[PDB]
Symmetry: C5
Subunit: 114 residues, 5 copies
């Protein structure tokens, strides 16, 4: 697996507009909401769950990086894997997307896989 | 269990106004006080205690997040489970509420579980 | 044991004015000095030692919180237990007070045991 | 092995201008891009992968330092080992450079091996 | 052992002026250069090496504190133990000093062993 696998999904020129932290089934988790910097389109929501899925090792790295990009409001590319989370109320509140990477986008193209 | 369980309680548009760190019964803990951004109501107090209660795994995550939101003073939704801490002097000083989640808020919507 | 135990001591309306980190007998430790926000009174010195005293479990959390309050300079209530550290040269450089809690304050009141 | 070995390569007077976090083959990783402070030259890209290469032990310290230098925008010397990463889509997105050190730079010199 | 042992060396009224992070012999390490706040004297250099020397337990505490004092540029006292690192190329690049403590300094005094 890799953040950059073409089977994952990514969204360029976004900003992190919201951040949530909680716990589910003994695991810490966080979720972020992103929107296009220019205001177009609809939001992207993605979560990371510390004890769960092949992406679990990156939970702290992703949380720390999400917090920094959230604090700056700088443009980013968000990378997700769709259709991972399953608890229906959790998915309906947030989404089934697993957060799998974050790329800064301060130049012409975002610094990450495409 | 989940932050967003309907048996938990939450309060929207709160500002984290105070922060305390201490130790109780072998465990570091922290408590926060929150007040309505609009100045109404009565404060909410909640604590997290390392290695105690079902919420223990998220102690460090919630401490770091509480510190950040305390530093910005931004309006948040605070999620708690009531009647978790039982040490009576602790409860009298703070509350029995276990902190179980924190959500940022726009002016119209907080980003977290509700209803 | 609890930060708020009557057998501990506390000082309100203080600012953390100095910070020191070191090691003793294989244990990292730190010390802080505090002074009244208004300039009155006598300084308070306390230390936490990572592997020593009943307060060992709280070392990292108090170090992180001390650094935060040190960096803001805001008014705090410092909680200590007297007569804990015993190495004479250490006590004479710093004091025998163990740091056991830190509470934020406003003008007339602080958020913590009293 | 040492950051300073002559079989590594380094580039002075650089600024970290992009940062990416992800995961590959169960390992958290991050990449940075640096550009000369004065606008000359070609960008340098390097990545650290949490449990791969002889440089695995310094992953966390170099991620934290990369983040610090990125946030200040100060001039640094970046130390890499060339030709380490091998997954082609990863190398072509980023590079084969392993990140092995970061040194702050003044006007005329940098604080690190050279 | 103690930061404050008389067999150690300290230098007061210093500013941390450079910071370097790398890896040696499986150990992440950092070094700092300090110079007098008033611009006099010759610089001091000291390193901390993750799982090396009696001072290893304090590596993370000292790295976090060095980073903070580096970021503010405030006057500090640096405490070292001489003649610890033995690799000659490493010593020649940096020094044999082990960093063993850091103390904030006011205009009047420094908060640490003397
Ligand atoms: C002219 C051209 O090169 N492409 C056409 C574009 O007009 C059109 O809209 C574009 O947005 C583009 C961004 O492409 C991605 C991205 O965000 O990087 C590519 C992603 O794979 C895609 N993600 C998914 C799950 O499909 C993502 C997503 O569609 C949007 O972010 C949702 O808003 O778009 C690029 O910046 C273009 O320059 C810009 O005009 C895109 C449609 O994505 O393709 C062509 O129609
Ligand atoms: C009683 C109730 O469940 N909801 C009341 C509303 O009908 C009403 O209008 C708005 O309610 C807003 C959102 O209500 C919450 C919140 O803070 O998000 C919902 C929480 O479940 C509730 N928590 C608990 C333990 O009861 C919480 C709480 O009542 C207040 O925060 C206490 O300070 O309120 C929000 O409260 C607005 O005040 C209002 O626009 C009004 C009644 O007129 O208050 C709601 O409680
Ligand atoms: C003792 C006396 O003569 N008068 C009492 C005063 O304590 C008090 O005056 C106010 O006291 C305020 C807070 O008192 C503490 C504090 O800092 O919170 C209480 C602590 O337990 C105490 N710590 C110890 C080890 O004794 C601490 C300490 O004495 C001082 O902080 C050292 O400077 O004081 C605060 O000091 C205010 O400045 C003052 O207004 C009055 C209030 O009516 O009640 C008396 O009991
Ligand atoms: C006396 C002298 O300096 N002669 C030539 C210069 O014209 C120039 O070098 C100056 O010094 C700078 C230091 O060069 C490095 C560096 O970045 O520290 C040395 C590195 O080993 C080298 N790395 C690799 C993999 O080759 C690195 C690299 O070439 C450049 O950074 C890529 O941009 O340069 C630096 O070179 C300055 O540009 C210059 O002021 C150069 C050639 O112009 O080499 C000297 O022979
Ligand atoms: C003879 C002598 O060594 N020192 C005295 C002068 O230094 C002194 O002027 C003051 O000295 C201050 C420095 O004292 C230390 C320090 O940095 O705290 C003491 C340290 O033990 C010493 N470290 C070592 C390994 O020897 C350290 C070191 O010599 C200097 O830092 C190197 O620059 O100095 C400080 O320098 C002030 O500038 C000044 O107040 C005068 C005071 O009357 O008497 C001398 O005997």
């Amino acid at each position: 697996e890799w953040t950059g696998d073409k089977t994952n999904a990514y969204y360029s020129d976004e900003v992190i507009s919201e951040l949530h932290v909680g716990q589910i089934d003994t695991s810490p988790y966080f979720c972020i909401k992103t929107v296009k910097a220019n205001g177009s389109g609809t939001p992207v929501v993605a979560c990371a769950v510390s004890k769960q899925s092949i992406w679990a090792p990156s939970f702290k790295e992703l949380l720390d990086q999400a917090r920094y990009f959230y604090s700056t409001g700088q443009s980013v590319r968000i990378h997700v894997q769709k259709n991972i989370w399953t608890y229906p109320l959790f998915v309906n509140t947030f989404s089934a997307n697993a957060l799998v990477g974050l790329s800064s986008c301060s130049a012409t193209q975002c610094f990450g896989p495409k």
